[PDB]
Design an enzyme around this catalytic site. Structure first.
Site, PDB file in Angstrom:
ATOM      1  N   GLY A  11       0.822  -1.210   0.000  1.00  0.00           N
ATOM      2  CA  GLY A  11       0.000   0.000   0.000  1.00  0.00           C
ATOM      3  C   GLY A  11       0.856   1.260   0.000  1.00  0.00           C
ATOM      4  O   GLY A  11       2.076   1.212  -0.157  1.00  0.00           O
ATOM      5  N   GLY A  13       1.611   4.082   2.492  1.00  0.00           N
ATOM      6  CA  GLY A  13       1.429   4.558   3.881  1.00  0.00           C
ATOM      7  C   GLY A  13       1.657   6.058   3.952  1.00  0.00           C
ATOM      8  O   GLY A  13       1.984   6.757   2.999  1.00  0.00           O
ATOM      9  N   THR A  14       1.583   6.566   5.173  1.00  0.00           N
ATOM     10  CA  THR A  14       1.769   7.973   5.491  1.00  0.00           C
ATOM     11  C   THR A  14       3.094   8.418   4.918  1.00  0.00           C
ATOM     12  O   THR A  14       3.203   9.291   4.064  1.00  0.00           O
ATOM     13  CB  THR A  14       1.603   8.105   7.019  1.00  0.00           C
ATOM     14  OG1 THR A  14       0.515   7.238   7.443  1.00  0.00           O
ATOM     15  CG2 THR A  14       1.256   9.496   7.494  1.00  0.00           C
ATOM     16  N   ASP A 119      -1.483   8.908  15.459  1.00  0.00           N
ATOM     17  CA  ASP A 119      -2.024   8.836  14.084  1.00  0.00           C
ATOM     18  C   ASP A 119      -2.733   7.510  13.944  1.00  0.00           C
ATOM     19  O   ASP A 119      -2.627   6.785  12.931  1.00  0.00           O
ATOM     20  CB  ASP A 119      -1.091   9.062  12.889  1.00  0.00           C
ATOM     21  CG  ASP A 119      -1.969   9.260  11.669  1.00  0.00           C
ATOM     22  OD1 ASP A 119      -3.184   9.606  11.826  1.00  0.00           O
ATOM     23  OD2 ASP A 119      -1.402   8.992  10.571  1.00  0.00           O
TER      24      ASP A 119
HETATM   25  N1  LIG Z   1       0.168  -7.023   6.393  1.00  0.00           N
HETATM   26  C1  LIG Z   1       0.740  -5.833   6.706  1.00  0.00           C
HETATM   27  N2  LIG Z   1       0.434  -4.601   6.318  1.00  0.00           N
HETATM   28  C2  LIG Z   1       1.070  -3.514   6.756  1.00  0.00           C
HETATM   29  O1  LIG Z   1       0.791  -2.201   6.383  1.00  0.00           O
HETATM   30  C3  LIG Z   1      -0.547  -2.163   5.803  1.00  0.00           C
HETATM   31  C4  LIG Z   1      -0.819  -0.605   5.765  1.00  0.00           C
HETATM   32  C5  LIG Z   1       0.129  -0.027   4.659  1.00  0.00           C
HETATM   33  C6  LIG Z   1      -0.299   1.421   4.423  1.00  0.00           C
HETATM   34  C7  LIG Z   1      -1.433   1.179   3.398  1.00  0.00           C
HETATM   35  C8  LIG Z   1      -2.496   0.769   4.503  1.00  0.00           C
HETATM   36  C9  LIG Z   1      -1.978  -0.676   4.764  1.00  0.00           C
HETATM   37  C10 LIG Z   1       2.064  -3.717   7.710  1.00  0.00           C
HETATM   38  N3  LIG Z   1       2.887  -2.962   8.426  1.00  0.00           N
HETATM   39  C11 LIG Z   1       3.750  -3.637   9.258  1.00  0.00           C
HETATM   40  N4  LIG Z   1       3.330  -4.907   9.057  1.00  0.00           N
HETATM   41  C12 LIG Z   1       2.371  -4.970   8.139  1.00  0.00           C
HETATM   42  N5  LIG Z   1       1.719  -6.001   7.615  1.00  0.00           N
END
Ligand SMILES: Nc1nc(OCC2CCCCC2)c2nc[nH]c2n1
Length: 290
Positions: A11, A13-14, A119
Site C-alpha cells: 500500500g 502509507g503515510t 495517528d
Molecule cells: N500485512 C501488513 N500490512 C502492513 O501495512 C498495511 C498498511 C500499509 C499502508 C497502506 C495501509 C496498509 C504492515 N505494516 C507492518 N506490518 C504490516 N503487515
C-alpha cells in the site's frame, strides 16, 4: 536493501510505499516501509526496543544511501480492510471487545514509556489469523511528522484526530491515542466512521455536532486553544445511545470516557483496561480470508 526481495506493494502509507518483502538471508516475510536526520534515527532506534505483543514488531531500521527503510513484522490484514470485508454483518462484539482490549494493552505499554502514536487509524491496526491485533507505525509521527498529504498526495485522514490537536494544541499527550481508538471503536460497532471530516473544520464541526461544542465547563482552557474561535457554532451534545446504538452501556460508558473533550479527563489506556466493559473479554478468531 539488496537483502530484501519485494513481493508486492501492500500500500501507500503515510511516509512512503509499504512493500511485503522477503528477507533474503533470514527467510522472513516482512513489511518494508521506505520512509535522514540524526534526530529521526535516534528516535527510530528507540522504537526498536518498544516491544509488546500488540505492537507491530519493528524488526530492523535500515539506514543506507541517505535512505531510511523500516522493516516490520508482517501481519496479514489491516483493520480497515477487515472492517470493509465485515461490513454486511459487522465485526462481532466479542471480537471488537478483544481488539479494543488488546489495542488498549498496546497503548498502555507505549504510553507507559511516553511514546504516543498520534495517528492511529484502522489502516495502522493490523490483525492476524489468531485473533491478535497490533498497532503499526507507533512512534513514527514524532520521528517524522504527520503530513497533510502522503507522498502520493493522498489526503491524510483527520477522522481520528483528537480535538486538542484540531484546536492547535502543540503539546498534546497520550490522550490523543485514546481519542483515536475511541473513534475506531465506535466505527467497528456502527460500521460507519464516527467523524469522517474532510477538512480540519469539518472534522472539528463533526465532533462538536455529536459531542457538543466544548466549553470551559467540560474542558477548562478550551476557549484559549490556539485555533478555538468564539464564533464556533454551539451545538448540543447528542446522546451516545444515538451515536453507537448497538453498543451496550459498559461499551458506551467506556467510549464516552475515551471521548472526553478534556485530554486530562480522558480515560487512560490502563484505566480503560480495568473498565467493566472488559469483564467478559475473550479472544475470538476473526473470519479472515487471506
Ligand atoms: N500485512 C501488513 N500490512 C502492513 O501495512 C498495511 C498498511 C500499509 C499502508 C497502506 C495501509 C496498509 C504492515 N505494516 C507492518 N506490518 C504490516 N503487515
Amino acid at each position: 536493501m539488496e537483502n530484501f526481495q519485494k513481493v508486492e506493494k501492500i500500500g501507500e502509507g503515510t511516509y512512503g510505499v509499504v512493500y511485503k518483502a522477503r528477507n533474503k538471508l533470514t527467510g522472513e516475510v516482512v513489511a518494508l516501509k521506505k520512509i535522514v536526520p540524526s534526530t529521526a534515527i535516534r528516535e527510530i532506534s528507540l522504537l526498536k526496543e518498544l516491544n509488546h505483543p500488540n505492537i507491530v514488531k519493528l524488526l530492523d531500521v535500515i539506514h543506507t544511501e541517505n535512505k531510511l527503510y523500516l522493516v516490520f513484522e508482517f501481519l496479514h490484514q489491516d483493520l480497515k480492510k477487515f472492517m470493509d470485508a465485515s461490513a454486511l454483518t459487522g465485526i462481532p462484539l466479542p471480537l471488537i471487545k478483544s481488539y479494543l482490549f488488546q489495542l488498549l494493552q498496546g497503548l498502555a505499554f507505549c504510553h507507559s514509556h511516553r511514546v504516543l502514536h498520534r495517528d492511529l487509524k484502522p489502516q495502522n491496526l493490523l490483525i492476524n489469523t489468531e485473533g491478535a491485533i497490533k498497532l503499526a507505525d507507533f512512534g513514527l509521527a514524532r520521528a517524522f511528522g504527520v503530513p497533510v498529504r502522503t507522498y502520493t498526495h493522498e489526503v491524510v485522514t483527520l477522522w481520528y484526530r483528537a480535538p486538542e490537536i484540531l484546536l492547535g494544541c502543540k503539546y498534546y499527550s497520550t490522550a490523543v491515542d485514546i481519542w483515536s481508538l475511541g473513534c475506531i471503536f465506535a466505527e467497528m460497532v456502527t460500521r460507519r466512521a464516527l467523524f469522517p471530516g474532510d477538512s480540519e473544520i469539518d472534522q472539528l464541526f463533526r465532533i462538536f455536532r455529536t459531542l457538543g461544542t466544548p466549553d470551559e465547563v467540560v474542558w477548562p482552557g478550551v476557549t484559549s486553544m490556539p485555533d478555538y474561535k468564539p464564533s464556533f457554532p454551539k451545538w448540543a451534545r447528542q446522546d451516545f445511545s444515538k451515536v453507537v446504538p448497538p453498543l451496550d452501556e459498559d461499551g458506551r460508558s467506556l467510549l464516552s470516557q475515551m471521548l472526553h473533550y478534556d485530554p486530562n479527563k480522558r480515560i487512560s489506556a490502563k484505566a480503560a483496561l480495568a473498565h467493566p466493559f472488559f469483564q467478559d473479554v475473550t479472544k475470538p478468531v476473526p473470519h479472515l480470508r487471506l
